[PDB]
Amino acid sequence: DIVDRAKMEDTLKRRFFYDQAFAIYGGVSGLYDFGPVGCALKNNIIQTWRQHFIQEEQILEIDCTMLTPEPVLKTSGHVDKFADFMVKDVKNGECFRADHLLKAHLQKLMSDKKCSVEKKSEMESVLAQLDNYGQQELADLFVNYNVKSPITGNDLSPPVSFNLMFKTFIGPGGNMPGYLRPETAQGIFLNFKRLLEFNQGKLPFAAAQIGNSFRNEISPRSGLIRVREFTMAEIEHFVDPSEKDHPKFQNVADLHLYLYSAKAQVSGQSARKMRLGDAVEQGVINNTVLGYFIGRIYLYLTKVGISPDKLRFRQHMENACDCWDAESKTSYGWIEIVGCADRSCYDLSCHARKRFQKTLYVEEVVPNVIEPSFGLGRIMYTVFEHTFHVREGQRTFFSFPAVVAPFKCSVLPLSQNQEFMPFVKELSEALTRHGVSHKVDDSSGSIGRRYARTDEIGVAFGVTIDFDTVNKTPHTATLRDRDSMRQIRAEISELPSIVQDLANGNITWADVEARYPLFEG
Amino acid sequence: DIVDRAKMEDTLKRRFFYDQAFAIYGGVSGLYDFGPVGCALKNNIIQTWRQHFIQEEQILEIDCTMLTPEPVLKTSGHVDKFADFMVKDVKNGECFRADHLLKAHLQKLMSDKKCSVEKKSEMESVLAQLDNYGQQELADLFVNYNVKSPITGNDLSPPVSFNLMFKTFIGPGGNMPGYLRPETAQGIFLNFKRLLEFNQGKLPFAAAQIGNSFRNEISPRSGLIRVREFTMAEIEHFVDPSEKDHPKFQNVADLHLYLYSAKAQVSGQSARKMRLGDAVEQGVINNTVLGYFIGRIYLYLTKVGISPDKLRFRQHMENACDCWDAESKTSYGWIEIVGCADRSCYDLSCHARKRFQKTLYVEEVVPNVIEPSFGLGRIMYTVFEHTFHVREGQRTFFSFPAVVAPFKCSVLPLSQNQEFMPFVKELSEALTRHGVSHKVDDSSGSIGRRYARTDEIGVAFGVTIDFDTVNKTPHTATLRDRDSMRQIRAEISELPSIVQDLANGNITWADVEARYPLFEG
């Protein structure tokens, strides 16, 4: 098994990382509220992202509106090329996703042990073309397989196209209908002219935006995986086709990562780990610019807490672009958490019919675009699942990296009493001076029971202040590690420094024990 | 005059702080896109906020959804208690805000020098009750004053109530209509139970949320002042009525700030500066909890760049709560940038008919709430206006505080050449190690012309690296100040430290000149 999601979900809920929105009103499907801890984790995730991409690549951040008029999203194609198929129940109403009902129905009839082998083959011939059947072509499949409701069957109406955009109206009731942006990339396209001039009109530049996009899902019942309101991080990197080679690729070429190409998928071959440099050598990856971001993405995700042996890069097949999607193995299977797409002919030239880029040799250049889109809720949930562990005890802890954990350290004073506040106080300030997130724990119970609470929310380190720390005359406090649970004893003035180094990749815990005396119960 | 907004707006646009959204589609009113510089300034504003309130008060951050179902917003009252009055043109369509048309019409007829004094008095008797007239009562005023369109008159239809919420539909076309949240506070109310348990069920606690709210304005034509999509920072501080006294008030009591009470407004008295402690003494401010946030708000706003002599705290009059709104004087007049409200009976007890708070003496307590709401676009625009200056030249510069300026420092290498990159490189890293935002300038032109560019976007400091910095053997570079424009010469290794100190309130520029040799042309 991948993970015990029932335990994981109970913990996520009990400690309020995220929970069903509008719970006291019955709760709305596809919508979630992130709590204090979830919010901390989330901001952390996002700031780490900011650093990794925006800062490293000098990207031009932009903040566009979510309210977009219909004309824009029509030039896009999004009124019914961005729809799903609904099948309505012929009388008592309920709506279902046609892709899903069909897939489920086939899998059902298929795993019946009184069906023919040639049926099984006919049906798989069908499941492998699901996302390609047209309106009429998919409608005939419903009849030819006698599909009906799944809760006591009734008949199902012919599948119709259902737009996934939230319809609204901008201004006084009138002639300006609009939608909530389905993606974040469009605003960047709309600002291509301004962004080009901001970059002095030079050829390669990247633009990013962090915000919420909306997808009116039909019947979402899979947690943060399928949601109607989600936070996204988009990047639009524009390149001259004539000069399509990233100068910083050498910094990533040495990485080994599982590549799941389209040809492997066609051949029915498995995932295949491969050195990135070699990947571009052998042509499994078209160019270094695409390869660079792939490696950068891999680095980002692994830094956030996603396990590399459950992380693969899958490339789709014939479903106008060379796309590589970062996928992670969860209790829901392999899901797309980050979509990176190399695109030559895209929606930018549509809004022009924004603009092009003139060169020094008087040449109008339509730049290609590499667009890595990060789905942060899924990324976050992947971290939850790859990080949730159960202890020897029945206790629970998240093994978040210190760079993403809600807060890096947690100080524990035994006494609420005074003479301690000066020690607690100075520790807090030194931590802050070192840029180390912390929170003073003031809960009621045993020290071990208090550390079990901090572990539950994934706090990386801990510094407990006992009586010897105040009285016994060279002031030393004890530092605990989340994972190992092992402890050491060091001078309280030195602790901020080593915790900072522990938070970064500077020193390891094995080094801390090497330099500092161990400590027990 | 307050400020030259035409110049200010041309600069804000040319450097792309913020601009009209969907410009290539004609542009949508009330919607704006913030550019790279605006985004930097904005994030800065927000992070400063985070520090000031969330960190200082250990507030519980939350991230709720913008999509809210109708039942919630009905328990609120927001389907037509949160509407405005529209007057439609009896045939050729156009819609107008009734408050505004009426106010304008009266002011017109009023400033006609052939009108009676008793008319002027009747009409002011009317302008002072605008936000109190009912549907029918306001309708009669339109007839009794013969109000018509303002662009060649035609008749105006009776004023009807127009809801300001963006209507939408959640899920498959059906029986779940919803809106885009008009305010951010409601999600906090909905999570009262979870937040109380998160705080161990203790009496005073605060919850905050930073995000976008929506108001479907009718005809917005005043820049960032009246927008349809805006970013907000809400705080909900809950207190036990029995123990309503903030322990940290003493930290703010010494502040002097302009208070514009309701009684002063009734008496036709002017704004009145007053020590905060005295304010609570004399009863102009009900309690210290309310007073605390007021002082905290004042501190926040002044830190961001808002001038204290253009900042006042105004209290409304009879328009179920004791509210104090932070107002700033702009080219649009006195506008509400931060609304702080003390409330006893509010919308939390409505959702319960979320919950209450049980005490140690078995007592169900309905907590009061102080809700400071920060309108960040307006705050930001206020900073633009209180900070925009024109130089002796026609050049322009923003005098942003270093804590809010897009980036704190800007290094200027004369040569693109190599031997310099090691100096530029080390400076960059030392700056980053000191947590000082910077950007290496690589533009083409004179050094003074390059500094004029950095000033235009409000970059606080500058470090120019010339040939003497590399060759001439004890390596010193020159540090320029934005405001004074004066320069000094110091060791390039020492510069990160003093720039950091300059960015904070540690040392002043007068100190830098005191310790370091001055430098000219």
Give one word for B325, left, alpha or beta, with left for phi > 0 and alpha for psi -120 to 50.
beta
Contact B75/B189 with Cβ under 8 angstroms?
no
Resolution given for this structure, in angstroms: 2.9
Where do we find the tokens 């350290």? A409
- Can you name the residues that pair with B118 across neighbouring β-strands? none
Nearest Cβ partner for B25 among A21, A64, A72: A72
Could you tell me which chain B residue has the CA closest to the CA of A86?
B172
Give one word for A117, left, alpha or beta, with left for phi > 0 and alpha for psi -120 to 50.
alpha
CA nearest A297: which of A48, A27, A21? A48
Q: Coil, strand, or helix at residue A194?
A: helix
Question: What secondary structure, in 3-state letters, does B18-55 show?
Answer: EEECCHHHCCCCCCEEECHHHHHHHHHHHHHHHHHHHH
Which DSSP symbol is given to B255? Answer: -
Interchain proximity A72–B162, CB inside 8 Å: no
Interchain proximity A170–B25, CB inside 8 Å: no
Interface size between A and B, measured as CB pairs under 8 A: 167
Interchain proximity A25–B187, CB inside 8 Å: no
Q: How many CB atoms lie within 10 A of CB B402?
A: 22
B217 is in an annotated binding site: yes
b/e A455-470 (16+ beta carbons within 10 angstroms → b): bbbbbbbbbbbbeebb
- Tokens representing A430? 């030194």
Residues in contact with B254: Cβ distance below 8 Å, sequence separation at least 6, in sequence order: B275, B276, B277
Interchain proximity B229–A65, CB inside 8 Å: yes
CA nearest A457: which of A520, A519, A414, A409? A409
Contact B116/B110 with Cβ under 8 angstroms?
no
Interchain proximity B36–A62, CB inside 8 Å: yes
Interchain proximity B36–A171, CB inside 8 Å: no
Q: How many CB atoms lie within 10 A of CB B439?
A: 17
Q: Coil, strand, or helix at residue A205?
A: strand
Shortest CA gap A219–chain B (Å): 8
Shortest CA gap B370–chain A (Å): 20
Could you tell me which chain B residue has the CA closest to the CA of A443?
B200
Which DSSP symbol is given to B460? Answer: -
Could you tell me which chain A residue has the CA closest to the CA of B440?
A58
Rounded Cα distance between A249 and A236, Å, is 18
Question: What's the sign of the alpha-carbon dihedral B157, B163, B168, B174?
Answer: negative
Strands A322-330 and A333-343: antiparallel
Shortest CA gap B286–chain A (Å): 31
Shortest CA gap B64–chain A (Å): 5
Q: Coil, strand, or helix at residue B513?
A: helix
Rounded Cα distance between A178 and A168, Å, is 5
Radius of gyration of chain A (CA): 27
Nearest Cβ partner for B228 among A67, A194, A200: A67
Interchain proximity B228–A22, CB inside 8 Å: no
CA nearest A458: which of A420, A511, A404? A404
Question: What's the sign of the alpha-carbon dihedral A277, A279, A280, A285?
Answer: negative
Measured in degrees and rounded to the nearest 5, phi and psi for residue A361 equal -95, 25
CA nearest A478: which of A499, A498, A495, A464? A464
Rounded Cα distance between B220 and B225, Å, is 9
Shortest CA gap B90–chain A (Å): 15
Residues from chain B contacting residue A33 (CB–CB below 8 Å): 62-65, 187, 190-191
b/e A397-426 (16+ beta carbons within 10 angstroms → b): bbbbbbbbbbbbbbbbbeeeeeebeebbee
Shortest CA gap A317–chain B (Å): 30
Method used to determine the 3D structure: X-ray
CA nearest A340: which of A206, A197, A187? A206
Q: Coil, strand, or helix at residue A357?
A: strand
Rounded Cα distance between A178 and A72, Å, is 9
Strands A409-413 and A396-398: unpaired
Nearest Cβ partner for A65 among B21, B354, B443: B21
Q: With the CA atoms of A129, A135, A137 and A142 taken in that order, what torsion angle do they form, in degrees rounded to the nearest 10?
A: 90
Rounded Cα distance between A421 and A465, Å, is 10
Shortest CA gap A166–chain B (Å): 7
Residues in contact with B244: Cβ distance below 8 Å, sequence separation at least 6, in sequence order: B287, B288, B289, B368
The residue type of A376 is L
Q: How many CB atoms lie within 10 A of CB B442?
A: 12
CA nearest B403: which of B21, B2, B48, B37? B48
Residues in contact with B433: Cβ distance below 8 Å, sequence separation at least 6, in sequence order: B496
Nearest Cβ partner for A22 among B25, B69, B194: B69
Q: Coil, strand, or helix at residue A430?
A: helix
Interchain proximity B63–A86, CB inside 8 Å: no
Choosing among A18, A28, A407, which should be mutated to test the B contact, i.e. which has the most B CBs within 10 A?
Answer: A28
Angle (CA) B191 B195 B196, round 5° = 120
Strands A476-481 and A461-465: antiparallel
User: For B216-287, where are the alpha helices, taking DSSP H only?
Assistant: 262-267, 276-282
Contact A239/A293 with Cβ under 8 angstroms?
no
Q: How many CB atoms lie within 10 A of CB B92?
A: 10
Known binding-site positions of A for glycine = 183, 234, 371-373
Rounded Cα distance between B351 and B353, Å, is 5
Strands A205-214 and A60-61: parallel
Domains and CATH numbers, chain B: 1-80+165-399 (3.30.930.10), 81-164 (3.30.40.230), 400-521 (3.40.50.800)
Residues from chain A contacting residue B60 (CB–CB below 8 Å): 35-36
Contact B181/B166 with Cβ under 8 angstroms?
no
Q: With the CA atoms of B394, B395, B400 and B405 taken in that order, what torsion angle do they form, in degrees rounded to the nearest 10?
A: 150
Q: How much helix, strand and coil, in percent to the nearest 5, is found in chain B? A: 35, 25, 35
Q: Coil, strand, or helix at residue A493?
A: coil
Choosing among B15, B32, B33, which should be mutated to test the A contact, i.e. which has the most A CBs within 10 A?
Answer: B33
- Tokens representing B42? 């904005």
The residue type of A38 is G
Long-range CB contacts (< 8 A, 24+ apart) of B70-73? B70/B176, B70/B177, B70/B178, B70/B179, B71/A25, B72/A22, B72/A25, B72/B186, B72/B190, B72/B351, B73/B165, B73/B179, B73/B182, B73/B186
End-to-end CA distance of chain A: 34
- B374 burial via Cβ count (<10 Å: 0-12, 13-18, 19+): buried
Where do we find the tokens 């815990």? A509
Rounded Cα distance between A412 and B14, Å, is 53
Nearest Cβ partner for A33 among B29, B63, B172: B63
Which stretch of DSSP H or E encloses residue B8?
A: helix B5-14
Which DSSP symbol is given to B158? Answer: P
Rounded Cα distance between B272 and B290, Å, is 18
Q: How many CB atoms lie within 10 A of CB A231?
A: 21
Rounded Cα distance between A26 and B507, Å, is 56
The residue type of B431 is L
Rounded Cα distance between B343 and B373, Å, is 13
Nearest Cβ partner for A168 among B166, B171, B176: B166
- Can you name the residues that pair with A180 across neighbouring β-strands? A67
Choosing among B12, B19, B24, which should be mutated to test the A contact, i.e. which has the most A CBs within 10 A?
Answer: B24
Residues in chain B: 521
- Tokens representing B456? 């235009």
CA nearest A100: which of A91, A115, A87, A81? A87
Rounded Cα distance between B92 and B98, Å, is 17
Q: What angle, rounded to 10 degrees, do the helices at A36-49 and A376-387 form?
A: 110
Nearest Cβ partner for A67 among B31, B69, B194: B31
Could you tell me which chain B residue has the CA closest to the CA of A171?
B218
